[PDB]
């Protein structure tokens, strides 16, 4: 009866979906062939409820990039995916200068090419990540306009993703991207109770007050089963 399965290494060594980047030809949001994505792990529920078990966490990540058309088909189209550290230039178009990647890391991958993996170290200026930050990172008087700043840890903003179709012209194919994360070399501190309520937002743990759900399943009488 070995305890290896219950270790935090094997529990976080699974890979899961952090975000989905969509880049269509026709539409509203990204029609130009480039998509900027701010880094957040809170987008999807399953991977979030594992990380919210603990408070502080120190880990290295391995990302996998799955590119396909929204119907599943694959076409020979070339793509560039770069990492913009905090404070760098963000490209305003696909022909801009920010794509010269003279510093920022970039990746050249095709659609028929097997997915791309990269190892990302622990770059936080603190000793560990904290998803729960109680306080106001600003100073001075705190009004209701800046109240949105509650629970915002400046140490957890690691950059912005960027991806484009490689070329001057526009490609007829609409691409969608599914990014995955595998937590490895993980350390943990201060466990917390898991969240029984449905998620609402990314940045703060708001729960619907009328939707409050009893954790256990109700029954008729406590003397019967």
């Amino acid at each position, epitope marked *: 009866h070995s305890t290896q399965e219950t270790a935090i290494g094997n529990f976080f060594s699974r890979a899961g979906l952090v975000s989905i980047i969509t880049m269509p030809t026709m539409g509203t949001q990204n*029609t130009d062939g480039y998509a900027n994505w701010d880094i957040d792990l809170m987008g999807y529920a399953q991977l979030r409820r594992k990380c919210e078990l603990f408070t502080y966490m120190r880990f290295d990540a391995e990302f996998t990039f799955v590119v396909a058309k929204p119907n599943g088909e694959l076409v020979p189209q070339l793509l560039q995916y770069m990492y913009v550290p905090p404070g760098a230039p963000k490209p305003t178009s696909r022909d801009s200068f920010a794509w010269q990647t003279a510093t920022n890391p970039s990746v050249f991958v095709k659609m028929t090419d097997p997915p791309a993996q990269v190892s990302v170290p622990f770059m936080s200026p603190a000793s560990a990540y904290q998803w729960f930050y109680d306080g106001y990172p600003t100073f001075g008087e705190h009004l209701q306009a800046n109240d949105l700043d509650y629970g915002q840890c400046p140490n957890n903003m690691m950059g912005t993703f960027s991806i484009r179709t490689v070329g001057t012209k526009k490609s007829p194919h609409s691409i969608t991207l599914r990014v995955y994360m595998r937590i490895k070399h993980v350390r943990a501190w201060i466990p917390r109770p898991l969240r029984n309520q449905p998620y609402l937002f990314k940045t703060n743990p708001n729960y619907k007050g009328n939707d409050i759900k009893c954790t256990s399943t109700s029954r008729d009488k406590i003397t019967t089963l």
Partner: antibody, heavy 109, light 107 residues
Framework: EVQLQQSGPELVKPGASVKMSCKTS????????MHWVRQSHGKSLEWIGG????????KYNQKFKGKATLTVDKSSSTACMELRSLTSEDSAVYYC????????????? | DIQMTQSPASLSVSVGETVTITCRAS??????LAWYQQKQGKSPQLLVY???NLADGVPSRFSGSGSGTQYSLKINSLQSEDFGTYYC?????????FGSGTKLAIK
């Protein structure tokens, strides 16, 4: 079935600002994009920029990006554009026309 | 930025003849064409979109066709209310660009 009414002709000295208004009806205002088009002499046309009236979504022409802004009031239905630092060659008739559902393409009807 | 040029600039034709106007793009859009009719002192009106399908309220005398870059618009048979300038548009890349215009007079 769909009517778009604009403001009246306006005259201003160079250097000041101007704000137009475009009011529509006959359809759900939040589900259709709107564009602005300028007609200079004689037949020449240009594309100012679009707007998506849910919260805000904006696309400007790279030439007109600095000389024009786009705002939309979602309560009372209107579309207003504002121009900064007018000059002699900026005088033209301006059009506002509805786009396609959830799309900037599918040219204005 | 894709540019488009129409030919001819001014086409004079009497009533009852076929008229073919063209629109050419620098890049191959394949999906996007819009022909407009602007009368004198009036707002533009859409005629044929997607290079083929005619819009609502447009008579059946207008048949557009084309593929790739070069496109065309054929009018048969011309009537007396169809005089005016014509334009062509691309949906493909921002900015949306318009042609130079083609004036249609009576011979």
């Amino acid at each position: 079935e769909v009517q778009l009414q604009q403001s009246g002709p306006e005259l201003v000295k160079p250097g000041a600002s101007v704000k137009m208004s475009c009011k529509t009806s006959g359809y759900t205002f939040t589900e259709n994009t709107m564009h602005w088009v300028r007609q200079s002499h004689g037949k020449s046309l240009e594309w100012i920029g679009g707007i998506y009236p849910k919260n805000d979504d904006t696309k400007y022409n790279q030439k007109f990006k600095g000389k024009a802004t786009l705002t939309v009031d979602k309560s009372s239905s209107t579309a207003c554009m504002e121009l900064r630092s007018l000059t002699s060659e900026d005088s033209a008739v301006y059009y506002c026309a509805r786009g396609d559902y959830e799309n900037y393409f599918y040219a204005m009807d | 930025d894709i540019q488009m040029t129409q030919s001819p600039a001014s086409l004079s034709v009497s009533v009852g003849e076929t008229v073919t106007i063209t629109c050419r793009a620098s890049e191959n859009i394949y999906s996007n064409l819009a022909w407009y009719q602007q009368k004198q002192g009036k707002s533009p009106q859409l005629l044929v979109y997607a290079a083929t399908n005619l819009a609502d309220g447009v008579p059946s005398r207008f048949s557009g066709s084309g593929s790739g870059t070069q496109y065309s618009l054929k009018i048969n048979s011309l009537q007396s209310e169809d005089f005016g300038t014509y334009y062509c548009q691309q949906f493909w890349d921002t900015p949306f660009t318009f042609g130079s215009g083609t004036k249609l007079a009576i011979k």
